[PDB]
Amino acid sequence: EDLRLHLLLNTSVTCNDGSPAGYYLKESRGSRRWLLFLEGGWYCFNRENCDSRYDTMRRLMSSRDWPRTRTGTGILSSQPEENPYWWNANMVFIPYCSSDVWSGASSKSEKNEYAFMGALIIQEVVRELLGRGLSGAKVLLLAGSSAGGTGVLLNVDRVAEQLEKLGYPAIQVRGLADSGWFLDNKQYRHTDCVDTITCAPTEAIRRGIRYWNGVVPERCRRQFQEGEEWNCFFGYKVYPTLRSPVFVVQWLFDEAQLTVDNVHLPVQEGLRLYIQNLGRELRHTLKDVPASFAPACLSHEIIIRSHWTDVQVKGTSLPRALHCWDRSLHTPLKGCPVHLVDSCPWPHCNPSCPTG
Ligand SMILES: *[C@@H]1O[C@H](CO)[C@@H](O)[C@H](O)[C@H]1NC(C)=O
Q: Which UniProt keyword terms apply here?
């Protein structure tokens, strides 16, 4: 229970139900590294599915029941045994209570049953942390898992711009996007968007942006233009538009990707080819991503799991790869790689994959 809750002092920046958003913080004095982690947990995109999420996933829509502390795990752990990478950093966990993939900029009002303020929550957390020691930082790593990983891609350059505009151009802003790199690929079985479960992420996100007043990074917005901003939620399309260094962690056979592809796991030829092609497409999208870790496993998220150190690609663990990334940001480094993508073509062809 080492990270302590702070509700935002600006109480106009709210969770979905208008309760104040917030963050959990464990300071490390004398460290100039700050890790801000964005929680995940899917999204909702219309009144009916947001109402259902409010009934049974209320902690993802409200701060009213949040505990006063949370325990840091994985990359948020302060113990070097669990976190070889950044155990001495200042740790921040930002709960996901906006259901908008961290993209929204709309308040609850006479027009809006819910507030979708994800993009403003991140900005407000950064602003309030500056007065709690972030002003002295050398590196701010914005990390996140699942929808929080996509949220890194959507917001890392805006955090960089915010700090520059606030007069902190020496803080190096970097991103770590875990399990947020999705493909707008053909589904294995096909359903028109006629309700929540049948609606593919491209259609659900196009609807969500309008419902949330969702915002995307400026260079990506300028490429795709009005009505096409949903493209910016897909990592392989938004990443090339970003300026901040971003390390991409993505299982090749991500369970959430398979879910949105209508795959539910003896596998016959059509599905075998489908799965193999998914891994091949994911690997292709990462070919020119220099800092990446993409194991051939059927799983979902990694960085805040306590056993995150166990998986390796080509003999290198993720904490090692992240350390090599830090060194690279001081020509490639002898024995300390940063681009680690499996080439074997089937889930758990890597023996270090999580056991489940
Ligand atoms: C509070 O947050 C809102 C929404 O982002 C912003 O417009 C406003 O300037 C903030 N107010 C203060 C006092 O920081």
A: Glycoprotein, Hydrolase, Phosphoprotein, Secreted, Serine esterase, Signal, Wnt signaling pathway
Q: Cα(136)–Cα(333) distance, rounded to whole angstroms?
A: 29
Q: What is the largest CA-CA distance in the chain?
A: 60
Residue 355 sits in which domain range? 1-356
Instruction: Record the resolution, in angstroms.
Output: 1.2
Strands of the chain (E only): list them.
3-7, 22-26, 33-38, 69-70, 90-94, 139-145, 172-178, 246-249, 253-254, 292-294, 298-299, 312-313, 316-317, 339-341
CA 94 to ligand 1 center in whole angstroms: 18
CB of 155 closer than 8 Å to CB of 105:
no
Sign of CA dihedral 29, 165, 37, 328: negative
Number of domains present in the structure of the chain = 1
Tokens of 175: 């991103």
Q: Is the CB of 21 under 6 A from ligand 1?
A: no
Between CA 69 and CA 28 the distance in angstroms is: 16
Instruction: Please tell me the distance from the alpha carbon of residue 25 to that of residue 276, in angstroms, as a whole number.
Output: 41
In angstroms, rounded to a whole number, what is the distance separating the alpha carbons of residues 150 and 40? Answer: 9
Q: Which residues, in sequence order, are CB contacts of 67 under 8 Å at separation 6+?
A: 5
- Helix 147-165 and helix 118-130: axis angle, to 10°? 50
